[PDB]
Design a protein around this nucleic acid. Structure first.
Lengths: 89, 67, 103, 58
RNA sequence: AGAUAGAAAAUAGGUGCCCGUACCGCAAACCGACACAGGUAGUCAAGAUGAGAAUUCUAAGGUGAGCGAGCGAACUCUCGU
RNA sequence: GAGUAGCGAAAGACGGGUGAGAAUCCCGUCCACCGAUUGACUAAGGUUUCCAGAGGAAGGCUCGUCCGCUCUGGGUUAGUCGGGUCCUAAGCUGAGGCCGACAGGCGUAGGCGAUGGAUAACAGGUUGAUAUUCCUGUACCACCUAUAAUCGUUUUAAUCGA
RNA sequence: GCUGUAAGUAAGCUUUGAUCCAGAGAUUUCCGAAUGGGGAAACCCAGCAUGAGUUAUGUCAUGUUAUCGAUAUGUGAAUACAUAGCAUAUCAGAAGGCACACCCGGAGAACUGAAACAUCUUAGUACCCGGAGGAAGAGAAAGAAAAUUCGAUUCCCUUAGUAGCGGCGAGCGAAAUGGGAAGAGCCCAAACCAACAAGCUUGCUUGUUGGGGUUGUAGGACACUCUAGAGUUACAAAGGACGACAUUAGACGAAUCAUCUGGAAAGAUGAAUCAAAGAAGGUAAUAAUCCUGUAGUCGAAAAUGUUGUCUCUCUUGAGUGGAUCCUGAGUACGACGGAGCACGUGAAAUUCCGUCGGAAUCUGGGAGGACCAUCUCCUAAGGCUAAAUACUCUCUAGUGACCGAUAGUGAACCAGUACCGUGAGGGAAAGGUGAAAAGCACCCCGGAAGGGGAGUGAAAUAGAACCUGAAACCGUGUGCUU
């Protein structure tokens, strides 16, 4: 726990526009709350977060060849830390 | 490689599970950021954590059943 | 059945009465690639991995039913049996004594 | 709806006519509600009037 | 009714979770098998004329309709005399 | 049947550009239609059709360089908005109970259930896609901790309450 | 050698024994009887205890909390005891699913046949629900019968489409005998009992405490006299301890070479060989001798069915009198209405249900198709019971004058899927390049799709929509015609 919920970071144009500011973007597990996220990040990177925002993305249709599928459901969190710098190197 | 793990006391074993879980995080954070290259390290540490938890279960289950 | 690196003769195909050393086994289609056997002419296209290309002359696989080990003594095509030396299934040329498969 | 004691319960059969035309019918027990002694405490239950002919204590 | 030695007061610091949020919605994303002349609750709804949310033109703002180019016969359709 | 019927209400013209190809795509000027609406919102419903690049087989009643099409990569941020959280109507369920050939039906206490009642955030800026959600400004509602300027038998109080 | 399909390119792993294959174990999100409360399955929202976290609050983790049922404690009304009722604790107690089968019940059609139709038939069939069990039901004579006995039951063959029942219409239709498979028998109530044990006052009564003995040669107590094998499939009922084959991985396993044609031989030709193996499938064509195997033999750490025993656990066996006593009560049975018997209410036995009545106790009771008298047989009204028998969701091995892609499953292929319907439900179409992917390097026209060379291949009118490639149909030439 506190490391199993941060699945991956998100590197995209909108996330990096948010990295110009102190907002960092992560791909978190689908069964966590803002609280559980704040704690995990401030535990790992030793940062002090001010706020965090969460959104749930629906499974998207993906056709691979002749077989249709659906992508996995996602939950994304945006942090806006005041003290610190999550370095994604 | 579960011999020395049996040789290891139940304490730092739980700490080994802990450390390997940390490593795994770092590997998958770097696979995403596209700085990994050694993508098979993920499976070896998954092996390692799996064995470490199996040994941890065997450690507590002998005691539970026998006294 | 034969081994990964022994020397065998071929009895099927355009290649018969010819020796050569086995280079790969492929145990799920029962097919070996011997040396020189089945020379192929494959048209490889200029790509990124392969800068250019051409007509490669690689070797193709053949069914294990088309090759045979040679008697280490008399170099004659022979079957292969087994004997239990110290409980180990080691091989015999079936017309003479022990047959060595080290590489 | 059975008799608490015996078990006399209902049964199906036929109402037959003079032309032997048949319709389904039923035959119920003469079940009467009586307060008898059950499991110690008195209780009201259905009991047939043939079981009350001789043997039951109200 | 009970319950209890406690904080209200005139401050200063912190904490506030889960689900929905794109897009269409008098419509080529909806109900009509269709990029269908039908149906689809509610809110805002300007100027000139008027009694008016009528009527004609226009503002804000949208749009030129997923086939065309000719010739202007018969015969149908819509319209005027 | 036949290269026949049909091409699904309507105003287009022209200059420039793009391309293998242009009445049909992009830009511009003029013209025209709606305007208690073909305009702006928001529900129900549909779910990715949304945005940026790229493509042209197929789908678009023609063509197509175009698109609600295809490929790639992206996009939905709330203590205050609508719900959950609070309340209940019509109905639906219903422990025990009543009735029932079995199946089961009915029903009390109690629950569920908005189309209703009660509830604290406004303006401006902002990108290709979001914004009472993000940011700037200023607020408000609950909750907790430290402190309190003396409320004062802790029965009554500063005041705690079905 | 491996990293499934399923290709990939990239990191790896593996003789220090990987991937595999068997046995055992661990983990096993969420929903679902779903069970903490709710709910539009796969989601929300909690109480309690313990822990994590925080200065605290928020937050999190792990347990626990449904309803009946049984039992055990408390507490306890209208009411005085008491009884409801409440509250705890416990309990591998119950739920639900299914194989679209077989079995036993509850309840029960209709079309149809009668050349109409109502009795009748369809048919106690279909469909419903309730129980099951691997089998179930039945089962130790109140029997069959006229010699006596299948001496329990079931099932098969025959009796036999006979006897019979039938608006005597359409139809329906036995049983005994005899021939077989398989066979097995038992336990209780009652009397009585030294007692025991409570009531009630020790006079007795009643109890499960227990014994006792369960049967027609009439059995048992009784009184005599006498004497210490079973079995967990009924016959009480538990479980360690040794073996024995078999089954959920496997191992060994005989004997062929040459030429010819070929793209390749297993074919042809010649010469051999093995066979407890010439089952079968592969292999570049048709193989007993090339490969996987086959006959034969061998083989389990383990976890199972199974079985020999050794334990173990149980424990009375008879006779003779027969004075008394006992032998299954609202029962048999009768009446009424129905149902069941092959048997339609009939002369209607035999048998069951509802409703009223209602018996005998061996010096008795029931049956022998109205029936009786006599004879013969049996001994009800309590219980248990394996085998022969029915069926196949499975698993294992194998078989087929069964099907070969409009067939055979609806389904050879990501099929109960596209799709259709609000929903029950309905429900497709679609296999084949080659031996090997060798899947067409380059060049030429074209934006591309295509093509034309060159090359791969035996073959490319085998180039991926790919084996063979018919007909309808559409074209391009033309000899003879108009």
């Amino acid at each position: 726990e506190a490391r199993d919920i941060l699945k991956r970071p998100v590197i995209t144009e909108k996330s990096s526009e948010a990295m110009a500011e102190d907002k960092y973007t992560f791909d978190v597990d689908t069964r966590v709350n803002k609280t559980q996220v704040k704690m995990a990040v401030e535990e790992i990177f030793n940062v002090k977060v001010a706020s965090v925002n969460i959104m749930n993305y629906k499974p998207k249709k993906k056709r691979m060849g002749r077989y249709q599928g659906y992508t996995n459901k996602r939950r994304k969190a945006i942090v806006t830390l005041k003290e610190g710098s999550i370095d994604l190197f | 490689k579960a011999k020395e793990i049996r040789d290891l006391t139940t304490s730092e074993i739980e700490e080994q599970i802990k450390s390997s879980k940390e490593e795994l995080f770092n590997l998958r954070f770097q696979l995403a950021t596209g700085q990994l290259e050694e993508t098979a390290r993920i499976r070896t540490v998954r092996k390692t954590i799996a064995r470490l938890k199996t040994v941890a279960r065997e450690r507590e289950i002998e005691q539970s059943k026998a006294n | 059945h034969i081994k990964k690196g022994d020397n065998v003769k071929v009895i099927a195909g355009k290649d018969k009465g010819k020796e050569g050393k086995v280079i790969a086994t492929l145990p799920k289609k029962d097919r070996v690639v011997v040396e020189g056997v089945n020379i192929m002419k494959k048209h490889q296209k200029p790509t990124q991995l392969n800068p250019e290309g051409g007509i490669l002359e690689t070797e193709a696989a053949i069914h294990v039913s088309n090759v045979q080990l040679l008697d280490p003594k008399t170099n004659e095509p022979t079957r292969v049996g087994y004997k239990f030396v110290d409980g180990k299934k080691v091989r015999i040329a079936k017309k003479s004594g022990e047959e060595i498969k080290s590489n | 709806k059975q008799c608490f004691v015996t078990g006399r319960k209902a049964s199906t059969g036929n109402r037959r006519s003079h032309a032997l035309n048949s319709t389904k019918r039923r035959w119920n027990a003469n079940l009467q509600k009586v307060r008898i002694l059950v499991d110690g405490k008195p209780k009201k239950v259905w009991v047939s009037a043939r079981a009350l002919k001789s043997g039951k204590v109200t």
